[PDB]
Design an enzyme around this catalytic site. Sequence first.
Site, mmCIF file in Angstrom:
data_model
loop_
_atom_site.group_PDB
_atom_site.id
_atom_site.type_symbol
_atom_site.label_atom_id
_atom_site.label_comp_id
_atom_site.label_asym_id
_atom_site.label_seq_id
_atom_site.Cartn_x
_atom_site.Cartn_y
_atom_site.Cartn_z
ATOM 1 N N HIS B 47 0.815 -1.204 0.000
ATOM 2 C CA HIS B 47 0.000 0.000 0.000
ATOM 3 C C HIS B 47 0.857 1.265 0.000
ATOM 4 O O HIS B 47 0.549 2.233 -0.695
ATOM 5 C CB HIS B 47 -0.903 -0.006 1.227
ATOM 6 C CG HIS B 47 -1.810 1.180 1.320
ATOM 7 N ND1 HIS B 47 -1.714 2.108 2.335
ATOM 8 C CD2 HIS B 47 -2.833 1.586 0.533
ATOM 9 C CE1 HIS B 47 -2.642 3.033 2.170
ATOM 10 N NE2 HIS B 47 -3.339 2.737 1.085
ATOM 11 N N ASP B 89 -5.965 2.143 -2.065
ATOM 12 C CA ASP B 89 -6.689 1.971 -0.814
ATOM 13 C C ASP B 89 -7.599 0.750 -0.871
ATOM 14 O O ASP B 89 -7.748 0.039 0.118
ATOM 15 C CB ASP B 89 -7.522 3.214 -0.494
ATOM 16 C CG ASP B 89 -6.672 4.412 -0.117
ATOM 17 O OD1 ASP B 89 -5.449 4.239 0.060
ATOM 18 O OD2 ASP B 89 -7.237 5.524 0.014
#
Lengths: 121, 121
Positions: B47, B89
């Site tokens: 991420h 996300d």
Amino acid sequence: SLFELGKMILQETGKNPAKSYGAYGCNCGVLGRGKPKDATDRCCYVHKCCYKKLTGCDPKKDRYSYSWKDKTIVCGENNPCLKELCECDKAVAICLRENLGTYNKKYRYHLKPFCKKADPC
Amino acid sequence: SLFELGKMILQETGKNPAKSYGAYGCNCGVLGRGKPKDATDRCCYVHKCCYKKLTGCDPKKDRYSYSWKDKTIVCGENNPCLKELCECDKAVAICLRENLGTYNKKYRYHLKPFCKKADPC
């Protein structure tokens, strides 16, 4: 940076900063501000308004120097932004210790959508 | 923004993102990257490398539009950066759920000096 911020909070409160203050109330942790739930939350409210005044440095990642002298946080930075930044983090850590008496774990991991919008700083 | 990220993590995992991922391993809810301690920590590593690839928007502050359609996170952006940010996300939220099976609470509030150098993104 968060490293100094967390370290100061640890020094003043004696508490693991991430666990106690990484996500407490409406003001301590990620995202912005919100109407504070208590005194502890209000420290972080003031803290974030203090961050807003900073220009020329990054409060999250920029590391800065300070010393622990006579069990007091003494910011040791000439650069105005870093020095102010240090004083922001020093203030909240002092503020958090002063209000540790009313710290409430029920406010840990509090969800943002259930925070009312903050007034401007 | 972090608000949309937090909501996705909740939507996918069913967990308060702060409690479970606000400070986990060497990549989740912590400053910087580190060698992932496990699969959940690896989600946050990816991420953060995902964020690093973005040009044109701010991961933390820039809000984007997405929807919950057939219990699936559906990004709703055409702008490349906001689209990629949303997918960044989305992917970590999904990743976190898909690795709840090896989620281990001992990695909560993990001590940073136990973190080794992260591989390059």
